[PDB]
């Protein structure tokens, strides 16, 4: 069974991709969807199997790489952390598959699309079920190849081809650092298996753990889209909406977080990386909360919301409460997938327009979508007793619960980042559903009012909700977004819970802050995020509905003109990357090609020896005039030079100077 969870998504991908002609769009959709539905059911069972019974499962198939001290197997371990990740990965993958039957119905290439969906699920399973870091890297690269294949699904569009280059190469930068980090592990311990690395971790050189932890963290920025290497994640919104719901906001983005959570038995022995994890987390939350409030694309806002939540989990990891980060990771993939599938539904209704400035009303036209995205937005802001309430609000009070400067700092930073989250959540829900209509009448012209006479049969197209294959995922994910946090709060938060007591999430007694977070933190800071959400939400509603002039005053002031464009342009990080990193590399390639390879390497080489020697040989060849009188003089000359050399006992070097002088005199013309 366990090895069958791994195998099923792979087989459905192969049928849809290499045999799409035989099965057709219907047969590809059925085999692809059914295989991942079956895998999802087998994985829910494996959660009861492994986690609730504390029975880890080991299976090794054959060796991959065999050398001295290097034995890396095609082996898989199922523990409490593995089955925890598999549930959001396979529930969301199953639902996005069912969703994609309705969303991609009109597209010409459905077999290729559904094949890439199953290929992504297979690779994500490989990433969380591996025995060792090198097989986890296969899923890491595999998910990257699948994200490139899905961002660039519409290859005809150049924008898509630029954005897929960004995703591929910004993730290769993280891969370089993981490869260095895995080299460090092999160099120190001789093998990179999890049992080996974690059993020996308490004793390794403390500075060796620094090198591995930094390399593991740098690799984690690229995939988890942390501020240093995050430019790719918003560009991955070029691919179709269901791709952005699973890969770009509910599964692959979390792999960086999984890498740190898996490596907890190692990075816990280096508090130096834990400060970097923590500050890395707090920066990305305010960095991306500010940007999303000034975006005009709905997908761009929901992409910048995901990076604000990924920054929350990395903050929790550096806070040294891994069960909290795992709890947020699973809870977030339910409501972030909901908002993306809900946004995808309004894009479908409004003729593929993705701009808030052209959406209005629509609340009466898309009632289910509005309520469902209201479900998602209340857990995104962690409204009390929602699924996101138990995960996001425990990260905040755990930051203040570690009574340190860095903890109180990140609490202030993260709380401000939460304020801007509430602002762009109102923006999305107000401008798409609650504001006056800002788009053409075609989305709002019904048949109850007669605008036509001889064309009443057709041509109204008034923004209707989709079909069963579209709404069904949205309803299910809504139920998760309301109740999943409560029903699983003990498995993850607990107080002395033993769910991860198979060393899947190792907390060192020195770093435990759980008891203080339960008792030490004052009620004011415990309740503080709630008042801010309720107060800002009403303030932004009035400034968007009642008092709409004031924001016009801000953006028409030169101060606010610069502040609006600064955050709209994403801190100008894209600007400085193309101009000083990307273009710098393309100039360097040109200078090597133009001035060195085709320049001085051929001048101080074959071409300069060619043109130099041909000139020399013509001059010496011009000494031969076929005159016996002049040839006789040469013999006497060459006779005397031999007599001088072997009678004046001259230094042999004096001769070589003569030859080099003579040769270079024939090198000069005229």
């Amino acid at each position: 069974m366990y090895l069958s969870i791994i195998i099923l998504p792979l087989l459905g991908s192969v049928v849809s991709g290499f045999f799409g002609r035989k099965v057709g769009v219907s047969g590809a959709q059925l085999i692809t969807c059914s295989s991942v539905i079956i895998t999802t059911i087998l994985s829910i069972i494996a959660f009861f199997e492994v986690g609730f019974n504390n029975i880890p499962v080991t299976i090794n198939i054959f060796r991959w790489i065999d050398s001295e001290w290097f034995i890396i197997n095609w082996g898989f371990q199922y523990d409490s952390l593995t089955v925890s990740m598999l549930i959001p990965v396979l529930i969301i993958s199953s639902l996005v598959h069912i969703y994609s039957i309705s969303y991609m119905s009109s597209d010409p290439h459905n077999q290729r699309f559904f094949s890439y969906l199953s290929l992504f699920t297979f690779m994500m399973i490989i990433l969380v079920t591996a025995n060792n870091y090198l097989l986890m890297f296969v899923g890491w690269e595999g998910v990257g190849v699948c994200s490139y294949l899905l961002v660039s699904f519409w290859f005809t569009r150049i924008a898509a081809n630029q954005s897929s280059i960004s995703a591929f190469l910004t993730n290769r930068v993280g891969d370089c650092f993981l490869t260095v980090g895995m080299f460090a592990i092999l160099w120190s311990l001789g093998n990179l298996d999890y049992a080996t690395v974690f059993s020996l971790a308490p004793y390794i050189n403390s500075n060796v753990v620094i090198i591995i932890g930094i390399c593991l963290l740098i690799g984690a920025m690229a995939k988890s889209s942390q501020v240093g290497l995050h430019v790719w994640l918003p560009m991955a919104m070029e691919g179709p909406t269901p791709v952005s719901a699973l890969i770009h906001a509910a599964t692959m983005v979390t792999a960086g977080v999984y890498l740190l959570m898996r490596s907890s038995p190692l990075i816990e022995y280096s508090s130096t990386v834990l400060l970097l994890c923590l500050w890395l987390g707090a920066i990305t939350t305010v960095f991306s909360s500010l940007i999303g409030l000034f975006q005009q694309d709905i997908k761009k806002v929901i992409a910048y919301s995901t990076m604000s939540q990924l920054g929350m989990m990395v903050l929790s990891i550096g806070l040294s409460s891994y069960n909290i980060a795992l709890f947020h990771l699973v809870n977030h993939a339910f409501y972030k997938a909901l908002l993306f599938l809900g946004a995808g539904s309004v894009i479908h209704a409004v003729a593929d327009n993705q701009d808030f400035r052209k959406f209005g009303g629509l609340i009466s036209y898309l009632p289910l979508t509005y309520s469902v995205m209201l479900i998602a937005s209340l857990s995104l802001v962690a409204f009390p007793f929602m699924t996101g309430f138990y995960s996001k609000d425990f990260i905040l009070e755990s930051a203040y619960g570690q009574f340190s400067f860095s903890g109180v700092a990140v609490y202030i930073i993260a709380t401000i980042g939460a304020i801007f989250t509430t602002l762009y959540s109102v923006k999305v829900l107000y401008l798409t559903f609650l504001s006056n209509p800002n788009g053409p009448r075609t989305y709002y012209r019904l048949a109850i009012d007669n605008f036509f006479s001889a064309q009443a049969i057709k041509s109204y197209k008034p923004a209707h909700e989709g079909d069963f294959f579209l709404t069904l995922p949205l309803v299910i994910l809504a139920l998760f977004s309301i109740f999943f946090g409560f029903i699983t709060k003990d498995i993850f938060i607990g107080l002395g819970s033993n769910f991860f007591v198979d060393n899947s999430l190792f907390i060192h007694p020195i770093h435990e802050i759980m008891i203080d977070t339960e008792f030490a933190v004052p009620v004011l800071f415990k309740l503080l995020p709630f008042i801010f959400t309720i107060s800002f939400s009403v303030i932004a509603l009035t400034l968007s509905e009642l008092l709409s002039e004031l924001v016009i005053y801000f953006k028409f002031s030169r101060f606010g003109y610069n502040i609006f464009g600064f955050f709209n342009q994403r801190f100008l990080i894209e600007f400085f990357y193309n101009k000083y990193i990307t273009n710098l590399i393309l100039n360097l390639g040109g200078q090597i090609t133009k001035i060195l390879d085709k320049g001085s390497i051929e001048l101080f080489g074959p071409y300069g020896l060619e043109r130099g020697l041909v000139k020399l040989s013509k001059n010496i060849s011009s000494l031969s005039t076929s005159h016996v009188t002049t040839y006789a003089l040469y013999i006497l000359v060459g006779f005397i030079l031999y007599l001088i050399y072997n009678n004046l006992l001259l230094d042999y070097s004096y001769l070589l100077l003569i030859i080099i002088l003579l040769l270079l005199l024939m090198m000069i013309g005229e």
Partner: protein
């Protein structure tokens, strides 16, 4: 000091209002009426609140 164009940003913002007369007034009047009046837009901003509020009061009265 004033530009050759009559554009002044202070005066521009003064006119950021709903104009009294507009040649396009009737062409745009559909966006503020009917389904798009103030009440109608926010009539169902909280879908299940009305049904839930009365239902929760029924459960709340359990003393009797």
């Amino acid at each position: 000091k004033p530009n050759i164009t009559g554009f002044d940003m202070r005066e521009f913002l003064r006119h950021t209002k709903t104009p009294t007369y507009d040649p396009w007034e009737r062409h745009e009047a559909w966006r503020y009426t009917g389904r798009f009046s103030r009440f109608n837009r926010f009539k169902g901003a909280l879908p299940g609140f009305g049904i839930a509020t009365v239902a929760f009061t029924a459960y709340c009265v359990f003393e009797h």
